[model samples]
Target: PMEEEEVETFAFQAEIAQLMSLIINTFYSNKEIFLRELISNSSDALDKIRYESLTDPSKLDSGKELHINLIPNKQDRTLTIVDTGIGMTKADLINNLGTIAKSGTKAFMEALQAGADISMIGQFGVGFYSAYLVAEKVTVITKHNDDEQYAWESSAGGSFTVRTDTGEPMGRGTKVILHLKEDQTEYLEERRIKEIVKKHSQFIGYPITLFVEKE
Candidate 1:
């Protein structure tokens, strides 16, 4: 039986704690680009499912609309990105995320400290870490096609922890929550988020929508 909220540190990016320590504490002035990076990641996942559907149409089992949602919670000071696409398993998380983590940490200090060309998100893969530009800590809650669900979290660009989520499962997909940094509080604005999406991610194939408060 699983212990309640038992957490384990995956440390897939073991060097991260030490690596980021080398860079001086800084924030990217070109912070709006994080939306570009995350939306690009979601777009790629959607493409993967689209490709799989070529062989197995059931890949569309999740839904046909296949949209992305950006919901902001001022109360919690979080901006969440949700995608209903090919979710990941524990092994998939370690294997894929490990590569993604290590692939781009190099030279990021200079790139971020200086004004980075967010357009380079296509050629550069360290795009996920761009969340640090706006968030103090990040949490990812994902449910794959399988029955189980998992959450991965990290802060200060350090080692990450992954563990089973005892709470209600999120159907089958990924939910990324960014704990807003003080300077990045502007991102919690719906108009600002939409503007950023239009600026960087307007051409993406998948639909991206900002959720409004329900009456």
Candidate 2:
């Protein structure tokens, strides 16, 4: 006798998927602005880690410099945001990305329905989700002292999935890969990305570098 295999399926709570689609489809106008949101997030992460190191130098490993790297891949039409900062653990990712309980996602929607400015929507930590505005797919590779390297992926639809990176090695920090949309290919230009960084994050404490393909 042969054993039978089982299949399982899951569904997003009724309003959750609807909310995500609504925000992703209508909240943002210019996809280019996602760069600013991502860089601003990197700056904040670097600041937090640096502040923590002041109290406990061991929090940041020796020989590790705080910095940000913007790598653009023209071949794949992808832009990567890398930062040497306090990386999030699996639990952190779930709590941060899975739900927007405190973000007032509902209130923000209501306001928009009543003709309020949607720009204020990201005032909360929902800025990370803004990456979905331009990327068809998103990948986050992160490492922390307490755990092995892990990768999280999502399409900015309803939910995200997380798994471990078996071979990838990130000493300590986070790297985000945005699979840019066809119309958003301008992000792959080094000059353009650098200009955005200087404009919005020049005053940030950490050094920002761009990886370019040289002839």
Candidate 3:
């Protein structure tokens, strides 16, 4: 029989824990904002990859156009945001999802603790996690430069599952599928989504596309 070894559990830093609590509790008033945050993030990712491609064209060998696709399925009550850009690897998913405050959350906290202006923290890298504000389940399918396509799924709890993508072939980029809550059905409407996109992201650098079924 093999002897059992004690598993070590680590606690989040005090400030990091406080910030997480604040975000989960009182930061967002309406869940719909999650869509906008996610779209903005996709735009940023596309911009980053585009800029990098300027000096290294091979960086974007996938040759997919820089664009975003918003698909709303009312029957399933799901909203999916897809982007063609620099997709993440398995290690990227673990570092981004598993650890708290690892993605500039600590810098935001440090700004707050130092009494420096911290308003921009909310506008920066933390936008990725905003999906949790509205989704009961979130699935991310990403294909990266040096790795195969992978799918990462989470229930907005503290843990997530990652596996190789086995569905339709994915090019180089990421797709985020959000299973909205019962109260978030408004996002399922095509017109509503288009209106939001026009209002907030009309001037965005990349082209935005909405996948909808005609009546």
Candidate 4:
């Protein structure tokens, strides 16, 4: 049974509004980079759990294989990326995605234009927002060993909401669902996803799988 909690909403930090606009407008031609950013973010989470579990194995789900799964529902026009990794607590969801310091914005845009690597992108704290480039709405369900499962949802309309997740139970990880825009249907194609993964994340350590209905 899940405990009930109010769905709390908060406006995005001002920087986020400007950041989303820049990403969607300025980088319109480079929209596919959103996949690279999302995949890299998942890979970083997997690495974190692996490292943190070294001394305290409790941080990890024992014997569960670590991986990333991409599920694209053509009928629903939604693409979901689920990762078995160190998940976010409620505060993490808010802090990581909501707040960005004033100066962080300029630095992030600079790094983004200079084609910084994944680690740099992570530091600038803007990689996750890249999802806004192709998704009309983004929903995140995450479970951390330290906190109850929670879901975060946003349309990049200057604010977002967080609430206790009532979905299927997750062991220890994060699931990001992207409600793709009509023009972004290419991302829903298995071939297109495989191609993007191959080009940007082929050398990543963990297995990345795409769920496809059996024909």
- Decreasing TM-score order of the candidates: 4, 1, 2, 3
lDDT of each residue in 1-215, candidate 1, tens digit only: 85667777755465444334432164335668788888888888878777877898765666655668999988888999998777788767655554345555665545644666544544555567677767878888877765478888878545677888877666677889999987678898877887888887889897888886653
**Where does model 2 exceed 4 Å of error?**
1-16, 114-118
CA-lDDT, candidates in order: 0.72, 0.72, 0.72, 0.83
| Per-candidate TM-score against the hidden true structure | 0.84, 0.84, 0.78, 0.88
RMSD of 3: 6.1
User: What does candidate 3's lDDT look like per residue over 110-193, in tens digits?
Assistant: 664565433344555665656766677888898877798888876643456777777786778889999987876788898788
- Ten residues in sequence with the least summed lDDT for candidate 4: 116-125
Q: For residues 1-215, could you state the per-residue lDDT of candidate 2 as single tens digits?
A: 97553322223333445556765677555555577777777778778788888898888773369888988998888999999888888766656656436446666667767876545556754556667667889888887767877777777656677777765687788899999889788888877777776765567767888889873
Record all residue pairs in model 4 with backbone atoms less than 3 Å apart, i.e. clashing.
Answer: none
Best by lDDT: 4
Shift of residue 131 alpha carbon in model 1, Å: 0.3
What is the TM-score (0 to 1) of candidate 1? 0.84
Prediction 1 global C-alpha lDDT:
0.72
Error of 1 at 180 (Å): 0.3
In terms of TM-score, the best-performing candidate is 4
